[PDB]
Amino acid sequence: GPLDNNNYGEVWLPIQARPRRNRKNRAVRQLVQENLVKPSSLIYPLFVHDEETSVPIPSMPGQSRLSMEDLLKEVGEARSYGIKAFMLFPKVDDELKSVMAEESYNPDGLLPRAIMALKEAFPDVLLLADVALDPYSSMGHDGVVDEQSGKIVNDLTVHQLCKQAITLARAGADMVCPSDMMDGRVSAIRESLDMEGCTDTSILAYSCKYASSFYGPFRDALDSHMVGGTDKKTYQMDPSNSREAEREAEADASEGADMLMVKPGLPYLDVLAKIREKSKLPMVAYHVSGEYAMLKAAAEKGYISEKDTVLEVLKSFRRAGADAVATYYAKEAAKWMVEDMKGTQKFTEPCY
Amino acid sequence: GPLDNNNYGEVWLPIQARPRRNRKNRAVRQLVQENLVKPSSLIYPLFVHDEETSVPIPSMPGQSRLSMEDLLKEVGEARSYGIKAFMLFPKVDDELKSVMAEESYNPDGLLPRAIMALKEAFPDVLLLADVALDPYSSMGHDGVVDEQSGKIVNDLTVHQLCKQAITLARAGADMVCPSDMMDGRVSAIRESLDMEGCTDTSILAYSCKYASSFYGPFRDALDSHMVGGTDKKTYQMDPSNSREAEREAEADASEGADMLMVKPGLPYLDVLAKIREKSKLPMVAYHVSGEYAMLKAAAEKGYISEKDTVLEVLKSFRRAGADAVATYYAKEAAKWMVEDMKGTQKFTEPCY
Amino acid sequence: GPLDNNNYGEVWLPIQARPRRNRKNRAVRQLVQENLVKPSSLIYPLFVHDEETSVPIPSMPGQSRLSMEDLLKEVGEARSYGIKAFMLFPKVDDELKSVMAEESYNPDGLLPRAIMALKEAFPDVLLLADVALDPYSSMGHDGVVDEQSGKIVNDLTVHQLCKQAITLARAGADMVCPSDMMDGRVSAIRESLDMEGCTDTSILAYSCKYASSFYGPFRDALDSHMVGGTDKKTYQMDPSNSREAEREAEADASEGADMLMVKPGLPYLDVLAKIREKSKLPMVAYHVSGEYAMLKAAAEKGYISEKDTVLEVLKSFRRAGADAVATYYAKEAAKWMVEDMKGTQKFTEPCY
Amino acid sequence: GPLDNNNYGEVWLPIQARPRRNRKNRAVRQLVQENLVKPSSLIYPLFVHDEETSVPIPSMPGQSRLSMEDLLKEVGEARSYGIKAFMLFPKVDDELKSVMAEESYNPDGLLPRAIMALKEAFPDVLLLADVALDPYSSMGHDGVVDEQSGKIVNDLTVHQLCKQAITLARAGADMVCPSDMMDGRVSAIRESLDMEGCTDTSILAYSCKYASSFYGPFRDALDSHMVGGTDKKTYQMDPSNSREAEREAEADASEGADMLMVKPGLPYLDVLAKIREKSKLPMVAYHVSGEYAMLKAAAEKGYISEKDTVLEVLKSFRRAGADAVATYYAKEAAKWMVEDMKGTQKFTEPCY
Amino acid sequence: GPLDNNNYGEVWLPIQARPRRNRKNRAVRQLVQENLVKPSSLIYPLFVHDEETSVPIPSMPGQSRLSMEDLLKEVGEARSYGIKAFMLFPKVDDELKSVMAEESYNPDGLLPRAIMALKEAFPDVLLLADVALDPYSSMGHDGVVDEQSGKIVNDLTVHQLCKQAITLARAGADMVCPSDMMDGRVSAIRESLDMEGCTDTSILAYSCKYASSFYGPFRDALDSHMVGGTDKKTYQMDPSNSREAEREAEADASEGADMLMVKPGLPYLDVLAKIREKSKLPMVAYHVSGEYAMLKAAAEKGYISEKDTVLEVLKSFRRAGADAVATYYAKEAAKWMVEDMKGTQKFTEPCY
């Protein structure tokens, strides 16, 4: 057979290469560790509403629709842990929503005020605002829906997204994040931004955004579910498709985007890796609302250890090729990191 | 002409892609930072001699030939800042050197004793021991020199390198590092280790090791300069060649090496990168004694800032593809990182 | 065990391939040597000021702020050893610097006069003039600094660099070398040049120029250190990044550059090799002032041998993929080569 | 149409890229020159015979069947110009030729005595000896011919080639060069050498040797033409095939060869470049007798300029991926280079 | 040892793959033959002058400056062997040559007259006409020379080339072949031809044409040698360079070229293969005059067999990746195949 004995009579498989040697102990694993997670690689998305008091999002346990005041307190808490990049979503008062979504470019709207207020209080902090009409749409769609046809009209939607993007830019958004999946919108937004003097303002293109069923809880957060049994499969991508992602990614880099987003997250790590291999831009992954609920719900019932699994997920995103990760665990992960770094350092060390 | 004007009359260059946007401020740079340095990715190389007192190495300013107790002191200090991996080189009494280099496999010799001593005191230290005859050679060559011909005899050298390797493994070296550039030694050493039951002991292969003039100060530290005008050009690689390195790398992986080393360092970052692309093994680079002497010399004269350049150098090794770097600055770099992290955290943060 | 005996009973490792055979002696090493350095692949960078007398640069020993007369002497000595290409930097009087850096396009300024003077004295000399405002900027930045934000404003800076490039081209510069890292400057300069009839004038694009700490001695030479504790990280590249280098290189190619420069040098050989692999343009590398200081520092203390290490360094740039290398050792290298060829030919031979 | 006018009414074609800028003058062309020729990359192939006087080979104008003493004079002359590698072929007395070709391994044969005489007169000289039976074959074929079938029997031939290689090695041949194109002979020869203690002796594998009509003049030189209107198409390669060359080249590399030869030369540059791209071994090309004759014929008639064309030829081999070139012009090329380098330096410069 | 014995005791090397098995006999070699040559892949370049009698070109033996009469007899004889493509070059009366080369665009010039009369005589013939100024230049340059600088001025030259191509296209040329190596001229000629309604006329772009010393005899044929010791190195490519070739090929593809030409031939087969590999356009190689002269010279002197060598060369061109080959042996080669086909069929067979 294949087994021999060694000089001392012990069983010996004479294989030369032994991969387990590089797993021998922590010091060796650390020497060869290929990927690292840090707090300033995490994006923390928050929800603000135009009310006096915060309200839990029951389907996103531990996250809330924050008042302006609790928004400031939350950003400040996250910075104390080394989070620097924040994503802002508004739960718009229902009376303001419409088919055309004109509230999206109202300079006195909730979102611009919040950006203005976070910036006054934390001038060095980094603000990403979503560009898309669904939070402002009475139909629950990211673009304008045609009365007669029911189609999400591409080009008319882009005209609007441009107006929103400039408003957010002017309020102080560092980065606008078109999550709308309309054809051609990166270039259009880019040109408008630039004509207005906002050449500094970045675009995080949602390039490869799938028509997922993992967005449930975010739509609760925003009360932004689609009306009347309609879906977004005429604009968000078919999860059956990878090749198509290259089509979209190539188009967004050449239209001027600063970073590409892949969304959702863990169930699309293959797409993340594929675009990362081909793109020369930074990549961002979005650990979406549904993915967060899955973790919390299993953690709440004791099925998994919350801390170990969240840290494993973030390392995975990072291994799969994400330069940054938008995650509702952003604050909690940084906190765990800073507490270990201050305690016994069971799993952390410094980096630069 | 190529300049236009924007909506407010200001000068406007109508380019879409603006890479500067991803450099806008520290928060964004961190979001998109592709490579990180951590202390546990640094290997600290140290010199021990058999004297009661430590002696400086004038051409490696700040480094010494260490007495056994100062070696323990120095490993302790580096550990406290998070260095986990230590390379050990013996400065051997000139009485014990010879043609065949017998002292190399003496189990009562200095290096085995040092290994055991450090293992008693710091059990979870990773100890890397050099395998090569030049510290023990009366000719100052890494292999056995023929009397009549002057050739470094490959296969007789490899016999000897097996004898040394086993000795160090038994002493407690976690990893042996053949620095000899004889042909076929990785496979031969591996098999001898395994036959003796040392299947756990790792080989860090000096695969792409060049006939460099950046090693002089190390040779000062060991008093190991080549006898009688000769050189190592018959075994170490011509710096003119890159294609040859792929030949060495491929052979060492199939011979069962656990990690591959490229040395010297900065002046070979292209070979490091080439082999990183091709290899599936972890890569190590060596920032050699000559390279250390250059930074140090210019720092003492005031020409460069020591901290900034050293930290840039280490980020470079890591960008180029080093999973780990051997550098005489390892202790000092970890010390800076740990101090910043305890202070203002001007340039570090936690990772995992 | 693996060791066998040959037919004469001598120790034999039965490996077939043996890379050491192609290292046997100088003659075989020469047959298989993949890279060669020649003087006409070196670019010699010099500093000129408007004073009667030359003044040494203490942090770049051997190099001086040259008077116009001594500039001509120095170019002449370098020509005689085979250097054909010379890069010129002006130390400008503090009184002519300003925020808009308008002295940069003054056709009676020091640099244009230096170019005209060198052209009258050696009509076939190859001159490469830097494009960038920092030698003329009272802020020590490569672009115009906005009063209110402190941002280095991109497009207005490009307009200035276009004027600068035209002035230098008109003065007789063979190549303009924009080292500014503004977005889009290559194409803008190209079109400006072409509209003025200077379609012959080349552009050496600094594509991958890093926010390095090795530029210090250069900034002593020009007295052009950044004001107020500011840095250049909003435009020079993060050393942590390689993928970004490809974004920059591909864009300068398609904007019409004739050559691509990676800078700094030895610590960026990985970026140099990667861009070499992907570009169809000639590559240039810059062995920068800080790198020069390190070598000198070490050589002066006797830690290394100056000649050996300089000659290996130059071979390394070349193996890594540099068609040309800009280096303050250019004259000295050529001299060594010419002395060896005129003498005993210990290391040189003819090529074509 | 496509033409516009610049700022001064001059015709202007607004193309951004102008490759001609990199051709502007000699200095620019030298900056970007991809390939260089040097004498120590040339192999000079020579003919010796066992007679008192030398005799021209009329179909190779300017080369001769050298007497032993003239062989020495010629090697000496070629060394003084920097040639280091010499290929040696015996024109064997016809009374010693045979079917078994046993004179190929006579240790008192002309080739072995030629090697010993050269190795005694020029100890640092590099000698390459052909391994093949055709110089000793009374039928003029590279291997043993079967009486009944007329097939060249492969393995029997390899057995004889091993005998021949050992003889040449023992006589002092630095490289043996099997030119036979039997299958498997690289591995057989390697192993036969190693067993005899000749692990130093190199193998220059003729991997891609084509059944060419360009060997005529060489066959005149050795009087080694095939009998009975036969050919070598059952062993040498069909010139119609390129894929096949990869199969050949892979086998020889894994059989242990030190370098790979493609032959003939210029009409197989495509093959040379292909194996250069896919091989990690040093490449050699053979500028064969027939190609030499074509250059000499045309120069003698005044149709071409000998010197210009030969020099362009060696540059082409070298651009196509040859590390070394076997050429009957080797001495004359070195001489032109040395004369230029000592004289006007119109086309040469020093390298290392 | 390496050899063993088969079941009858015969010497046997136990190698599994044997490449000679696919060379066993003509039937097998034919089965696996990767490349074929046919007459309709050959282009026959001819010379016409405006005299009553044809005149031998002594440096291209067997080729002549043909009278119009004799030009029609030669195309007929070649069409009778299967050649369908002809290249036409005019020797111009020295009285009509200018600095501006206006005769190039004369619709009553020799060349337009050759074209029209060949189309009248054979409508099914494919005529390729050169586009370049050198047959018409009093300086012997492919472009207009500035009296003041001596530079071949690119854009003004392209203006002229467009006029010539329009002229030759109206005359009936199926294909114009810009051999001039000015930058951008393929695009410019294409748009010009198009605006005149010559959308059907093809452009074979001399993409990678090198500054070669193999053009001598063609320049004899036309009496077109460069005046006053000048060269074409500021537009034709440096033979030292291959990467540059990719850059020219990419540009000409993207400017609308139908086919791409590499020139010269055999000594550039590496460039031919690389371009073949990257390009999606048909490739043409030019076996230039100097190459022809070398074959003829050696053949006349009896050093090589003309027929075997020529046929081998053409097969090589095709293996290297030539879809078509311009060669002065086109008629002679086609005649050899036809004769073998109509005869005893030693080396040809039918194809489609």
Ligand SMILES: NCc1[nH]cc(CCC(=O)O)c1CC(=O)O
């Ligand atoms: N265009 C809006 C938007 N931006 C972010 C998310 C989902 C984020 C999450 O689930 O956490 C969505 C919802 C959707 O498009 O249906």
Ligand SMILES: NCc1[nH]cc(CCC(=O)O)c1CC(=O)O
């Ligand atoms: N084979 C021994 C060895 N191990 C490391 C170095 C050099 C290390 C240094 O310069 O830091 C050397 C010397 C040499 O090979 O000449």
Ligand SMILES: NCc1[nH]cc(CCC(=O)O)c1CC(=O)O
């Ligand atoms: N654009 C300015 C310039 N041009 C070249 C150098 C540095 C060269 C060296 O260090 O030798 C610099 C300084 C900088 O940009 O910070």
Ligand SMILES: NCc1[nH]cc(CCC(=O)O)c1CC(=O)O
């Ligand atoms: N196998 C022997 C041998 N070695 C080199 C050549 C030819 C070299 C030349 O033509 O210059 C030949 C002849 C052949 O194989 O037919």
Ligand SMILES: NCc1[nH]cc(CCC(=O)O)c1CC(=O)O
């Ligand atoms: N552009 C002119 C032209 N077209 C074809 C040839 C050469 C053809 C031959 O050598 O057979 C030349 C000469 C040159 O460019 O100098």
Ligand SMILES: [Cl-]
């Ligand atoms: Cl912090």
Ligand SMILES: [Cl-]
């Ligand atoms: Cl963990």
Ligand SMILES: [Cl-]
């Ligand atoms: Cl910007």
Ligand SMILES: [Cl-]
């Ligand atoms: Cl830093």
Ligand SMILES: [Cl-]
């Ligand atoms: Cl030009």
Ligand SMILES: [Cl-]
């Ligand atoms: Cl050297």
Ligand SMILES: [Cl-]
């Ligand atoms: Cl010499």
Ligand SMILES: [Cl-]
């Ligand atoms: Cl030449």
Ligand SMILES: [Cl-]
């Ligand atoms: Cl067979």
Ligand SMILES: [Cl-]
């Ligand atoms: Cl044939």
Ligand SMILES: [Mg+2]
């Ligand atoms: Mg899209």
